[PDB]
Amino acid sequence: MAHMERFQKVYEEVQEFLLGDAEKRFEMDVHRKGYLKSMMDTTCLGGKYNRGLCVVDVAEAMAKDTQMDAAAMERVLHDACVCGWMIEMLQAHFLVEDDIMDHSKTRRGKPCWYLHPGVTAQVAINDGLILLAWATQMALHYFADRPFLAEVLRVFHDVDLTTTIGQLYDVTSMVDSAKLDAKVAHANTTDYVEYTPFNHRRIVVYKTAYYTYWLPLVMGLLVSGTLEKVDKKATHKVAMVMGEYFQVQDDVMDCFTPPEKLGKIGTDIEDAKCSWLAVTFLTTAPAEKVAEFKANYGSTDPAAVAVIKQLYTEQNLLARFEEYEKAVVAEVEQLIAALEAQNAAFAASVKVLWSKTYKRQK
């Protein structure tokens, strides 16, 4: 990828800064510095970098569009890389915490951070908090003299909030909402009445679309000083459409993509998650198959999980996804075409992001 080498160079730069700053400010000792280095490397590296690299792709596109000279271009690319790492560390934070919340086993082809024997969930929770803090530290340091610092902080923290609310929807989705009461436990649902297209859309847009699609695009515009050049509503709309689709893919892959290819072991079925598969099945399957689903879903029994997979297969869920995908392609293309009529350079950068999303395999 065009910016991978530069992006990785900036990682090393940022890591040196952050660890050195802890030495300077907090009397950080050699052993804990090494621990934090290993923590950062394990939690921030090994993903696809779609979010971080998007910031750079957008920033470059807009820098070229606005005819920046050699020096201005170099600054924008470095700033874009720093913003990219802000999002990658936000991602790192989210995944650390989520892997604890989901009690998961693997991430990016390695054990989950909390499952490293010298870590445990009780230390890992705080390691996740360090990651989130570091993200803001990068902005405060690298963008101290940039008027765009304020807007970077605003969008970043708005998106942090958004994702945590999306997560709230996700973690509370398998209990009937009228029964959500801190003082009273309640079993997972038996009737699945709340497993609706509306509720699935709400979970995925807030937990995924804002930080995975909207944030990278906006940060790229902010660092290049070109936010005013594009249609705010249109940009938001296309980010939501792609982001929803991205999470749908993730949902489909939970069941149908081998864990060794995916790099993680999802447990959506045994955890009774309101996934795209569950919602699409429940709303389209004949009554006797819905009965079978309800009798098997949300069970850790490997055979019960297999029953659900079989039900999904026999209900042609993959074909139904293919049809959903065709509708998404059409809408995304319409939205990009409209963006292109306003600013072609930005529209092309959305196309780049879309191309890395459409029909991805992991």
Ligand X SMILES: CCCCc1ccc[n+](CC(P(=O)(O)O)P(=O)(O)O)c1
**170 known member of a binding site:** yes
* Contact between 350 and 333 (Cβ < 8 Å): no
Q: By rule CB under 6 A, what string of x and - marks binding of each residue 166-185 to ligand X?
A: -x------------------
The token duo for 354 is 């879309």
- Is residue 187 a contact partner of residue 286, using CB atoms and an 8 Å limit? no
Binding string, residues 260-289; x marks residues near ligand X by CB under 6 A: ----x-x-----------------------
Alpha-carbon span 79 to 148, nearest angstrom: 11
Instruction: Evaluate whether 17 touches 85 at the Cβ level (below 8 Å).
Output: no
Between CA 40 and CA 30 the distance in angstroms is 15
Q: Counting contacts by CB under 8 A, is residue 146 touching a second copy?
A: no
Binder to ligand X among 79, 88, 127, 250 (CB under 6 A)?
A: 250
91 binds ligand IPE, rule: CB under 6 A: yes
Q: What count of other Cβ atoms lies within 10 Å of the Cβ of residue 6? A: 18
From CA 268, how far away is CA 288, in angstroms rounded? 22
Residue 207: name its binding partner from ligand X, Ca ion, a second copy, none (Cβ under 5 to 8 Å by kind): ligand X
| 338 φ/ψ angles, rounded to the nearest 5 degrees | -70, -40
Residue 275 structure tokens: 């996934």
DSSP-derived 3-state class of residue 181: strand
Between 129 and 318, name the residue whose CB sits nearer to ligand X: 129
Binding of residue 108 to ligand IPE (CB under 6 A): yes
User: Which stretch, 7-15, 46-54, 229-237, 280-288, contacts ligand IPE (CB under 6 A)?
Assistant: 46-54
3 state SS of 268: coil
Cα 43 from chain centre = 14
Angle at 336 between CA 160 and CA 213, to 5 degrees: 15
Query: Phi-psi bin for 27: left (phi > 0), alpha (psi -120 to 50), beta?
Result: left
User: Contact with a second copy (CB under 8 A): which of 64, 65, 146, 158?
Assistant: 158
Options 145, 181, 228, 288; binder of a second copy; rule CB under 8 A: 181
Backbone angles phi, psi at 233, to 5 degrees: -65, -45
CB of 48 to ligand IPE, least distance (A): 4
Taking the CB of residue 29, how many other CB atoms lie within 10 A of it?
11
Residues 215-254 that bind Ca ion (CB under 5 A): 250, 254
Q: Which stretch binds a second copy (CB under 8 A): 149-157, 215-223, 228-236, 276-284?
A: 149-157
Nearer to a second copy, 60 or 160 (CB): 160
Residue span binding ligand X (CB under 6 A) among the ranges 4-12, 161-169, 221-229, 324-332? 161-169
31, 81 Cβ separation under 8 angstroms: no
Pattern of binders to a second copy over 207-226, x per CB under 8 A? Answer: --------------------
**Rounded to the nearest whole angstrom, what is the least distance from the CB of residue 121 to ligand IPE in the complex?**
19
- Rounded distance between C-alpha atoms, residue 79 and residue 56, angstroms: 9
DSSP-assigned letters across all residues of 206-251:
IIIIIIIIIHHHHHHHHHTT-GGGS-HHHHHHHHHHHHHHHHHHHH
In the region spanning residues 95 to 154, those forming contacts with ligand X, defined by CB under 6 A, are 97-98, 102, 126, 129
Q: Which of 82, 130, 252, 307 binds a second copy (CB under 8 A)?
A: 130
Pick one of 57, 79, 88, 102: the residue that binds Ca ion (CB under 5 A).
102
The least distance separating ligand X from the CB of residue 24, rounded to whole angstroms, comes to: 20
Binding residues: 98, 102, 170, 250-251
Binding residues for Mg(2+): 98, 102, 170, 250
Residues of this chain that bind ligand X (CB under 6 A): 94, 97-98, 102, 126, 129, 163-164, 167, 207-208, 250, 264, 266
Binding residues for Ca(2+): 98, 102, 170, 250-251
